């Protein structure tokens, strides 16, 4: 699991810096950290397994895992020492071990008292955390560990004091260059007593915070209320520069279905607590204590009842005549992903919700919105194109990579109009992708199979899909002029047809 | 930087003692007496001078009572409960002990020997006593951050 | 801005084949034009910008040919690649043969650099409503490419000829359709090309197409510095971050995680592997996520891995706060990855009911409840018709009112019911809601309103499926409930009195400090404001 990156240098047992790191020795800093972070440690870091074991060269997982919740300060308080001193395996080796045996996503609290001292001359090893610019010879190596990790700041030497020998840059450019996570936590100058807990104090009040937000559709009469607040979440920046507010234009619209929903990108934990209340909107009473009050019916979200048979999802009204696509897990009642979300705004319409800003046909339409094999229909609304796993995938980073991506996208995208289950699902995903991307493999294997299937299959469709091939050769032959009047392109192929009389 | 004093009662008379002092933005009432002899509408001080049809607690931060005489504390229950002053009222311990019985006697007089259409009652007298803060001799209390 | 034609005068080969990963008909040639080769690398170029915003618009390209136009689409429906591809390939579809057409630059050299930010009539919005912008434009583009041909000046001949032809007809200098008349500009470009072969190509060679544009080049190896160093600074400084995960569990696959998790936290890469299951509790709601924009956008685990992932759920195999190792998902427009919990969120052993309603929801049979398809038909549309007519109104305020009157609250569950719980509940919205309404349903509902109060202990013919013996007050409660029939929003089911007679019941140091003191003061007395000569009349009403 996650391992705290402790320095394996002999100086780690003794104080830090050339003459003084900050305030008293390491014991005082450890005691201050234990006293200030005890409330946070007992409530937020109860499941973080860290062991204060000895190491010769780098942090390694040898001792059995233990539930250390208030022994973090003990790691730097009267810790054991070993007869080894490896300066090159203190940060680089520990970071590599964390990246490999613990991954870039694991709860790790790298908080300890370490010297972090460079050489007494031209021996500064700044490649441990600043491999991006300094020591470019190792730029192609695993360094500088570009992955999420705990902040390690070494504010031992003062920038003003170390500037006499022109060595201030080496000592100061350590914390700030460590992946640049959010902001540079580096203090240059004199040290005070309160600076010991300054590093640990960055998350004193950053565990939980109250909020006010309610998820509902239109007005309703059994709307769910959410008393506890969730973690911060925002999809865009302009719409959420400050805390969220409620407008006076609530509306409910859109179909809810899981047949053609799939896993969409969700970044909002707008959970609805399951409880039933009157029009006033009180709490109504909201080891598990929910069972006692859960005997009465509850609303929660619209997908609570359908989360088992079909695995439906909960939709949040993003606005009038403008909505989005949500998603939910196949789980029935364990989690169910009971939290709505809306795709982040952008110059293109929705990340996966398609064009939800245009209202057209409602019930009467040429194509049935119900669908047969999760084809393109407005029930539920979704993007016109499919996912990159199926077709319409534009990934060209290398010629071989582009060819492989084209082949994968155009593997089953070449389907003739013989089966109604996928007549309007990927009809235009074969020729356009093969021609625009210039994929020889698709034009050789997929295109020939598609042409053979189309020839074998019936071609008694409407004249737009059948009679258009008679004059196509004439149009191609008579394209020598190349003028703008010889080519027409205003809209692509659409499923709807005109209602003109045949004369 | 001015001390503005407006005695709206007992200015050039004896009775209905009620003096307003604005010293540093702290508006204090120095007494809340009542007049004797007047039949109606002049027994109590004119509290329309302090922006009537509003909350008196915002304007006044402290009300002080010198002693338990009716010309120094008689209008206290009417003032407080009726006009809606929920702020502190300062008065010594014997003043706190002996004030409500004088008010009760005058209330008995008003309900029996005269009319009582526009007078207060015993329950409303007891309601006023809740806001009272007893102050001992030479006890420099801190009613506000800077006012003592 | 401008791209040269597909003249076959200069050609080169890089031995580019199809990289097979697993281990009779004719084969089409892999011949491609220099402009096509340069454009083909633009997909990797957009990967760097995708980190800033993955759901934003993409970038197209236009060249000088027979179809010399800067036609592009910016509409919401046209934002996808299905519609914009036909306008960027207007110069000719992919057909391997000798094409004599489009070789001459005299086909047209006006409205040339208008294919990166110009708007079209496909949308009804304005420029400001879309994205606007000034000099610094997010939709703006430049010319940067690393291809192989005979020389860099071979493609410059067509551009020079086009520029000369444009200059030869400069009479209509003050006339344009919608865009500005571009005169000159300077273009900064970078160097990047796919790996696979040694550096047997130009290292510091720059191509110029017009006197206005004159780029400069330098020796910088791609991949080692272009992707490993530039992307790191381009991601962290663009309100995003990148993580390291295993590519093939046991081409690099890169996950996405925000820096908020790192802030709140305090030689083969090893990661766990698991397969999805139909019945498994391992997926939760992602409170935060990041957009994955890896250079290897066409790696092996991109299509086959996602084939068995249509359920939408993820599977995590925790050792013995669970942390995920890798995730794969295709959202159609961008690839996104989600990280595990980092803040004080109850993810392990959450408030799951795990009993009662939620799984057995079948009270609303689909046999005759499908009449709601008309009253609540407001859904998004992707392709409109030429014109529409019928019983409808503008979609600004009528749609919300119609939905509110039709589907504001349509809950149906058998967990608990005491208002419509009657044996004659057939008159509910499943069949009552119809365009041609009849008074028979209203009369039946009114009769059932009294019937429910009359009888509530017996079971209906349909399968139904504070001490004890409290059912005595149930009849009184039902009678009280029936009294409120003409309440809430039930106008059709309202009943005043029908059969209540039979068995139903009835109811300057001294300046600054003085200013500071006077600034923090309190409201004035009304009488003092209204006073005259520092005196005011008391008891004015008398
Ligand atoms: Zn007196």
Author numbering:
A (entry chain n): 2 to 287, 297 to 513
B (entry chain k): 2 to 149
C (entry chain m): 11 to 33, 41 to 267, 279 to 294, 312 to 365, 370 to 514, 523 to 564, 655 to 689
What did the study's authors say about this model?
The Integrator complex can terminate RNA polymerase II (Pol II) in the promoter-proximal region of genes. Here we present three cryo-EM structures of the complete Integrator: one bound to the PEC in the pre-termination state; one bound to Pol II in the post-termination state; and one of the complete, free complex in an inactive state. In brief, we mixed four purified subcomplexes; namely, a tetrameric subcomplex containing INTS10, INTS13, INTS14 and INTS15, hereafter called the tail module, the eight-subunit Integrator core, the cleavage module and PP2A.
